[PDB]
């Protein structure tokens, strides 16, 4: 009814990517666009990884994105053209860590229109003008300059209107301090639409057109206009002026062409196809990426064909005129949307589906071995310059950046018997596809193992000095063993080391330079090179409880309480204070923390008491043993910690069930206890160090790391088991880490991926996985894989054998039948080199039963050549007994544009024995592609496509029992609540259908008024149906309160059904939601609708409890639409009301940017709300804490 959007793991697929000196330094940065998201990435050169520095939601679609450098400038400004009618120029302020909007100019109505510009964006390479252009009729030129405050200024938009004109691409022609020119591939179509003969629109070739901006006359003129003997798709800038032969390369199907006007003859170079790659009946070959590079001696282009074959295009010019162009097979990577080759020799590829990559360029130039050919060599008979594909020679993989796009189908399931559920995801397009399992924890990777017998209680990590890294010893105790192991190789039980004292030990630390304190029954040790121990700890009797150590200062207790300090001398040995309080006993824990300065005491004391109380005491010599501020806790703490995590001392108690996080400042203590929960065994809080700073590993039933990642306090769990203890770790075996065991073994751990939320683990697949089901007995995934333009591998083997046949038949007298055999037995990895593409209308498809634990192909069933799967359901029939069945809807000869199926099939399988294999049962035919299978009342329901049929098992084939024919255009989804059917039309909407028991009828009794183009759906109540569409929205259609089902069966109401259902939310997401599921992501949490979109993102829709929460967050985001406008200028209410108007949904991704404004804005909003900004941030993260991650 009243919902709330939150993104959990925001979108990861990259559409545009640009590079440059956005920070303003010598090093370069990538700015990518995730479509709705705009992100800055730093390619950290020494370690090679990729770190995100900023990610904002622009709330638009970034239709185009391009960086430009102002003339005589250091920093590059980002330039964004979007669905708003706005050009917007951004500057990355590194100090405040945000994108400062420099300018924002309006030029037309909004939304992804045809006439208003924003689709194509070109900039002058010197940085003096910028052209933003539409796909039809109108173009705009802004003139950029700088005024005397070194500040950017924008003229009024110049106009370059040209009626009836398509634009395929636009680009900045480099002219060195000349009038700026822009080149574009146009096409005039008015004679193409006036002549009904059809041939006039068949000989209407493109035109390369050059627009020259007369800065003296302040207007734009068509300078040159030259036709093209093929259709080019996009252009590449050639640098010029003094650097090169100023012009534009033109990529096209099977050609690359240098054109430049005036005097250059048009240079054609046919694109090298592969040797005998088996994807061409008749298909051409285009480029998809440009990736220019200017290596300060020459310039080259890392172009890329549509399979992934990167080419090194180099212009070699003898005159000032061009002479001939030439290229060669550089390398092969997965197919990219955009490339940014980097000075310092990196190559970033952004695969549009699957993972992105960062490569180090190993052998640039590559002018040594390879058979390179050229343009102007007299080669005839088509292409005739081939190349043999090969593995990597020029690049080495450095970083694999992760992405879930495209999430094609998803399940929330708890198959691995863990407490929290898991996300079972289908992902990827093609041979790079993968099933991916996602958990909430962190990447806990074990590097070494030991097997510590008995039952150890605790472990401590200590070094020789404060300056080293080897961490010379590691001590492990339970009651009586000290076992202070050597840390490195041959890790095994120790004799009396240079730091060892006695056997029954209880703590250690480095106190002095090399002076250690180790604590045991007769506690005090002080050992640097000589075992200079002074073991008093006898106030008569008591000798064991509650160590609490820092680096300079100590406070330990005995049975009793507030007691001895036992410090040292800054030039010498230990001493004490004899001022005691002795504190009627009440102690469970103590903890402290020490500051990097301090020629004084320079810490704070926190003690936890057996009674429902903790206590902080400052033990500075003035005001010593005197309590400072008080407490409150419900049951018992059992743990305490003090930490500092930013770039406010973050008091982390923990109680035996829940944990807190206060904000103790050093003179004054304004606590402000953040709360969260952790069976419920007592938690234990251990300060460890990750990434450069420190954090608390608080441990319970499952472990929880609480680290401050850009001041956000990610309290994320760990993927391992319960471990009962933790301590830090450093060695050269693994640089940082955590040694963390009190149970029967020993693990050295690493927390590698540390920024993110989910743990990806991938199980690779052959094709695009449409959807999968879950065998609920003995949990196993049953996946259908299906790809248009793809061979099933029987045809791969037959096509390879046929290739070998004509290679040994085509004039082999003179010979090499070595070529055919070597071709047959050298199989290239299709995940690496791209799958072959089987013309048109071919359809590879398999069916895979897979373990969701290890991810192995427990069963594989191919299909035939054009027989493509589309829908799968496991079920258990009623007329037969317990035994499972698998129903697979298959189509045949589908061809998908223009749509002409040749009728489908439904295969029936048995899924014996435990579900590990899959026996054929029978093959029923059906006259249209059965795209929806749904078990219902011991039978199945099949949407044939306009036809809904009940079915039942026969031993020969499936047997229909009912049929309906009044459901409209095409079925794509069938879901049932029991006695009701929800039929998702592919175009109109949800159609309620009643199934009767006495009869067998299928009576439509309700539909919806809107056309929707529904892609997937999910049931929420007995009445409501939440669905999502192709365009991006999410609707929730609740039936009216009457809608009586009892309708027995000529007019309709509005050419449809009679009880028109009605809509209780509409919301825009910007991505196509493919999986909606009602579930509960955290035990102890609550239900929340989980949508997984197509561009990798994962979000939730969350109901509100009460009207005070609804009204509060409504006024929050209603203030944020005012104070904090989106980046593109796209109005947030009119982005969320893109197709249908928004209804009863509060965009919490605008709300969670309350924590991203400067505190002037935060104080304005919070006092306008009559709260405080920490109170609002508490109230705002309560909802994400409660329902989700």
């Amino acid at each position: 009814m009243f919902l709330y959007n939150l993104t959990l793991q925001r979108a990861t697929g990259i559409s545009f990517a640009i590079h440059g000196n956005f920070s303003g330094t010598k090093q370069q940065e990538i700015v990518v666009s995730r479509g709705k998201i705009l992100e800055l990435l730093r390619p950290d050169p020494n370690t090679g990884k990729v770190h995100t520095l900023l990610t904002v939601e622009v709330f638009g679609v970034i239709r185009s994105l391009m960086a430009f450098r102002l003339t005589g400038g250091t920093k590059d400004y980002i330039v964004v053209g979007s669905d708003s009618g706005r050009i917007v120029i951004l500057e990355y302020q590194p100090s405040k860590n945000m994108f400062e909007k420099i300018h924002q100019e309006t030029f037309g109505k909004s939304g992804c229109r045809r006439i208003v510009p924003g689709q194509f964006l070109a900039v002058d390479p010197k940085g003096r003008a910028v052209m933003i252009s539409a796909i039809e009729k109108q173009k705009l030129v802004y003139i950029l300059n700088r005024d005397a405050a070194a500040r950017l200024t924008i003229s009024s938009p110049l106009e370059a209107h040209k009626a009836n004109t398509l634009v395929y691409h636009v680009v900045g022609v480099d002219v060195g301090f000349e009038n700026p020119m822009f080149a574009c591939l146009e096409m005039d179509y008015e004679e193409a639409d006036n002549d009904p003969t059809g041939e006039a629109a068949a000989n209407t070739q493109q035109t390369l057109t050059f627009y020259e901006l007369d800065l003296g006359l302040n207007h734009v003129v068509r300078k040159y206009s030259e036709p093209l003997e093929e259709h080019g798709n996009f252009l590449i800038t050639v640098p010029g002026g003094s650097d090169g032969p100023s012009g534009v390369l033109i990529c096209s199907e099977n050609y690359i062409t240098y054109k430049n006007f005036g005097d250059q003859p048009d240079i054609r170079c046919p694109i090298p196809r592969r040797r005998n790659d088996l994807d061409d009946p008749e298909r051409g070959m285009i480029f998809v990426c440009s990736a220019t590079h200017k290596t300060k001696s020459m310039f080259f282009f890392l172009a890329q064909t549509e399979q992934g074959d990167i080419f090194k295009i180099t212009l070699e010019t003898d005159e000032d005129m061009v002479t001939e162009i030439r290229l060669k097979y550089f390398d092969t990577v997965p197919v990219a949307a955009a490339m940014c080759v980097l000075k310092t020799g990196f190559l970033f590829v952004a695969s549009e589906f699957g993972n992105h990559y960062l490569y180090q360029i190993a052998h640039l130039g590559d002018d040594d071995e390879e058979p390179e050919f050229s343009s102007a060599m007299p080669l005839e008979e088509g292409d005739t310059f081939f190349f043999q594909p090969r593995p990597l020679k020029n690049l080495v993989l450095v970083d694999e950046l992760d992405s879930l796009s495209p999430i094609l189908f998803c399940q929330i399931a708890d198959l691995a018997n863990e407490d929290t559920p898991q996300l079972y995801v289908a992902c990827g397009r093609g041979p790079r596809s993968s099933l991916r399992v996602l958990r909430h924890g962190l990447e806990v990777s074990e590097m070494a193992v030991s097997e510590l017998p008995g039952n150890p209680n605790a472990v401590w990590t200590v070094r020789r000095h404060i300056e080293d890294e080897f961490d010379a010893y590691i001590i492990v105790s339970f009651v009586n063993a000290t076992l202070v192991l050597s840390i490195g190789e041959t890790v095994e039980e120790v004799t009396d080391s240079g730091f060892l004292g006695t056997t029954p030990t209880l703590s250690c630390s480095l106190l002095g330079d090399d002076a250690l304190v180790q604590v045991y029954p007769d506690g005090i040790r002080h050992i640097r090179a000589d075992k200079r121990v002074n073991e008093w700890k006898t106030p008569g009797k008591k000798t064991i409880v509650k160590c609490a150590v820092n680096q300079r200062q100590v406070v330990i207790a005995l049975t009793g309480g507030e007691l001895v300090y036992f410090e040292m001398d800054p030039s010498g040995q230990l001493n004490e204070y004899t001022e005691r309080k002795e504190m009627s006993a009440d102690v469970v824990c103590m903890s402290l923390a020490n500051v990097p300065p301090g020629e004084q005491r320079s810490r704070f004391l926190a003690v936890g008491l057996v009674d429902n109380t903790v206590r902080i005491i400052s033990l500075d010599p003035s005001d010593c043993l005197q309590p400072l501020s008080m407490q409150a806790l419900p049951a018992q703490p059992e743990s305490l910690c003090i930490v500092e995590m930013g770039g406010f001392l973050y008091l982390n108690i923990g109680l035996q069930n829940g944990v807190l996080l206060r904000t103790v400042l050093d003179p004054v203590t304004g606590d402000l206890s953040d709360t969260r929960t952790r069976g419920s065994r007592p938690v234990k809080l251990f300060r460890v160090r990750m990434q450069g700073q420190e954090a608390v590993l608080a441990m319970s039933s499952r472990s929880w790391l609480s680290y401050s990642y850009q001041s956000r306090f990610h309290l994320t769990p760990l993927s391992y088991e319960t471990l009962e203890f933790a301590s830090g770790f450093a060695s050269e075996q693994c640089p940082e880490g955590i040694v963390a065991i009190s149970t029967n073994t020993l693990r050295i751990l690493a927390l590698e991926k540390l920024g993110a939320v989910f743990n990806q683990v991938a199980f690779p697949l052959q094709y695009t996985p449409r959807k999968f089901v879950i065998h609920p007995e003995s949990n196993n995934l049953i996946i259908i894989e299906t790809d248009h333009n793809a061979y099933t591998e029987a045809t791969k083997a037959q096509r390879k054998q046929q290739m070998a046949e004509e290679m040994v038949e085509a004039a082999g007298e003179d010979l090499a039948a070595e070529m055919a055999a070597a071709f047959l037995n050298e199989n290239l990895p299709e995940s690496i080199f791209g799958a072959p593409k089987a013309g048109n209308g071919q359809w590879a498809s398999v069916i895979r039963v897979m373990n969701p634990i290890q991810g192995n192909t427990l069963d594989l069933v191919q299909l035939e050549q054009n027989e493509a799967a589309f829908s799968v359901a496991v079920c258990r029939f009623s007329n037969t007994g317990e035994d499972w069945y698998v129903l697979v809807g298959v189509a045949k000869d589908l061809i998908l544009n223009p749509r002409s199926v040749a009728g489908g099939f439904v295969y029936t399988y048995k899924l014996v024995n435990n579900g590990e294999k899959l026996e054929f049962l029978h093959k029923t035919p059906v006259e249209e592609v059965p795209a929806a299978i749904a078990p219902f009342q011991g039978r199945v329901l099949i949407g044939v496509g306009k036809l809904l049929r009940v079915y039942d098992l026969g031993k020969k084939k499936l047997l229909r029992k009912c049929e309906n024919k009044h459901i409209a255009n095409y079925i794509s989804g069938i879901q049932t609540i029991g006695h009701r059917v929800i039929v998702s039309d592919v175009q109109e909407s949800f159609i309620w259908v009643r199934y009767k028991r006495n009869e067998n009828q299928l009576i439509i009794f309700a539909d919806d008024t809107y056309p929707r183009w529904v892609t997937t759906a999910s049931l929420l109540d007995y009445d409501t149906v939440a669905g999502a569409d192709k365009f991006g929205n999410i609707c929730v259609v609740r039936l009216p309160p009457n809608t009586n089902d009892e309708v027995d069966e000529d007019r309709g109401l509005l050419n449809g059904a009679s009880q028109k259902a009605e809509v209780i939310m509409n919301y825009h997401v910007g991505e196509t939601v493919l999986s909606l599921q009602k579930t509960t992501l955290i035990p102890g949490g609550s239900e929340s609708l989980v949508y997984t979109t197509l561009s990798g993102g994962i979000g939730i829709l969350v109901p509100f409890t009460s009207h005070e929460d609804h009204d509060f967050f409504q006024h929050v985001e209603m203030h944020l639409r005012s104070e904090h406008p989106p980046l593109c200028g796209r109005d947030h209410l009119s982005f969320r009301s893109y197709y249908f108007p928004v209804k009863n949904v509060i965009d919490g991704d605008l709300c969670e940017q309350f924590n991203s404004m400067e505190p002037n804005k935060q104080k304005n909003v919070s006092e306008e709300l009559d709260r405080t900004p920490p109170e609002v941030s508490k109230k705002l993260e309560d909802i994400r804490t409660r329902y989700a991650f």
């Binding site: 501020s629 008080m630 407490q631 409150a632 806790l633 807190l660 206060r662 203590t669 304004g670 606590d671 402000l672 206890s673 709360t675």
Partner: peptide, 15 residues
């Protein structure tokens, strides 16, 4: 919570 106006003490208690 408190006695005067039932405000959330949130564990915070000071002199």
């Amino acid at each position: 919570r408190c006695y005067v106006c039932d405000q959330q003490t949130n564990g915070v208690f000071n002199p």
